[PDB]
Structure 1
């Protein structure tokens, strides 16, 4: 189960989940074009897409439990790039002995976990930082990158799409990037040349 489901990382996770035959739940913020987004993410590979309101919902919890029970499997891993209440919600959805990896904090809100998950459900919360993981792990880097390249060459993976801005010399390069930073909310930004 992952939050920030519309993130570029979220979109790769959904696709990799599909390629490896993992079931997944993506949690996303509600928006006016909710249906279009849900459809995109399902096509990428998310098995179910829920809103953050559904994530917060005690009433909705049993529905998720039904999905997992029907699959014969368990929710074993949570991916958190949001923090706050979102991190609470995805943790609660894990089966006992679950793991959460926090790899980002898209609001400044801390990772917040109810005491009961730790004590009674044997929940564990840990970090992920690709830069640190791969520092002295060049074989692991190479193997991972090769798989992504191969998948792209095979037509099995697509990119989290970027909004492209071309540098041509008429507007200073730093301003293109400043606009890109300011338009982060619109989606992944790529300055081209």
Structure 2
């Protein structure tokens, strides 16, 4: 009655290609404490924050332990993932075998095959058999379940928790329009009847990307060259005037000249939220917007916001779940790599890191 599991670990910080390895360890399913549960991993993605943890340049990080049976202290990898309950202890009533779960806290370590925890280390999601038996037209896919805990909540909370946009009338503007968060924000804008402008990098297949973002819910899509153009400012003013509303909110994950351009398109009393910085350039705002247009620039970090606010986390997650079940929200598809034991587990994640430019990478089990 011993389960053999695999985990991706490191003994020292550095680049994933250099420091990651796979460790085998054992879990005893015949001797669970009353509140313990055992889970098997169904899938977990490679997110940028996971990589920064390994590099040692992220301010929140799991402790190095000898608990996986290593020769030296070693840390696990990954914060997001979808798990299935295999067995529960005698006092567990909130979970049963077959339930789908995600970690309730950060630093769980999701790049591995199995885990042992307490029942309150997890949040329950409905699995497809449960959604179907209760008459829902859809159930969660593995990719949808494995990525539900961050990017959908980021987009929802940025759009609803800070400024009240008037339906049909008001606008938000965002850069990184082809990012995962950007695509969730376009869909949520459409569902809540918010107008939006998406700014994106130009590309060889621009017409196809534009059509795809408008189908998700972007009202208009413009290139970074158009974002930089001062002669374009009157066209955008006329979009906003025709709707009878105002551009009240800007979402920035790029920085530099892109952040300047979307800040200039807000009406007076506008707010910018910076939630990423993929350009690695600082946020750059002209003095005149602060002084004469009452502009405010602030930050967003979902981990900090939800730290001591679990009603808000619960209520936001329930809404994302309901929209997936009703067929109203869709995920950006990941490139999936299945672990079948012929290739060491850490090499699949090393490939996921290296190929992240191709798109979101999900390792499945």
User: Larger C-alpha radius of gyration, 1 or 2?
Assistant: 2
Q: How many Å apart are 1:161 and its aligned residue? A: 1.6
Q: Separation in 1 of the partners of 2:355 and 2:223?
A: 23
Number of equivalenced pairs: 193
Q: How many Å apart are 1:174 and its aligned residue? A: 1.4
Comparing both structures, which one devotes a greater share of its residues to strand?
2
Q: Separation in 2 of the partners of 1:88 and 1:38?
A: 22
Comparing both structures, which one devotes a greater share of its residues to helix?
1
The SS at the match of 1:164 is: strand
The SS at the match of 2:285 is: coil
Q: TM (normalized to structure 2)?
A: 0.52
Q: How many Å apart are 1:169 and its aligned residue? A: 1.3
Q: Separation in 1 of the partners of 2:266 and 2:243?
A: 14
Q: Separation in 1 of the partners of 2:339 and 2:256?
A: 38
Query: Partner of 1:122 in structure 2?
Result: 294
The C-alpha deviation readout for 1:80-132, integer Å capped at 9, x for no partner, is 00011111111000001000000000111000001111011110000000000
The C-alpha deviation readout for 1:41-95, integer Å capped at 9, x for no partner, is 1000000010111111101111111101111010000000001111111100000
Q: How many Å apart are 1:183 and its aligned residue? A: 1.6
Q: TM (normalized to structure 1)?
A: 0.98
The SS at the match of 2:174 is: coil
Q: Separation in 1 of the partners of 2:346 and 2:300?
A: 30
- Of the three residues 39, 54, 59, the one matched with 2:231 is 59
Q: Separation in 2 of the partners of 1:172 and 1:93?
A: 49
Q: Where do 5+ consecutive residues of structure 1 fail to align?
A: none
Q: Separation in 2 of the partners of 1:181 and 1:26?
A: 27
Q: Separation in 2 of the partners of 1:171 and 1:57?
A: 50
Q: Where do 5+ consecutive residues of structure 2 fail to align?
A: 1-172
The C-alpha deviation readout for 1:11-30, integer Å capped at 9, x for no partner, is 00000000000000000000
The SS at the match of 1:13 is: helix
Query: Partner of 2:263 in structure 1?
Result: 91
Q: Which runs of 4+ in 1 moved over 2 A?
A: none
CA root-mean-square deviation: 0.7
* Greater alpha carbon shift after TM alignment, 16-25 vs 153-162: 153-162
* Greater alpha carbon shift after TM alignment, 10-19 vs 53-62: 53-62
The SS at the match of 1:135 is: coil
The SS at the match of 1:76 is: strand
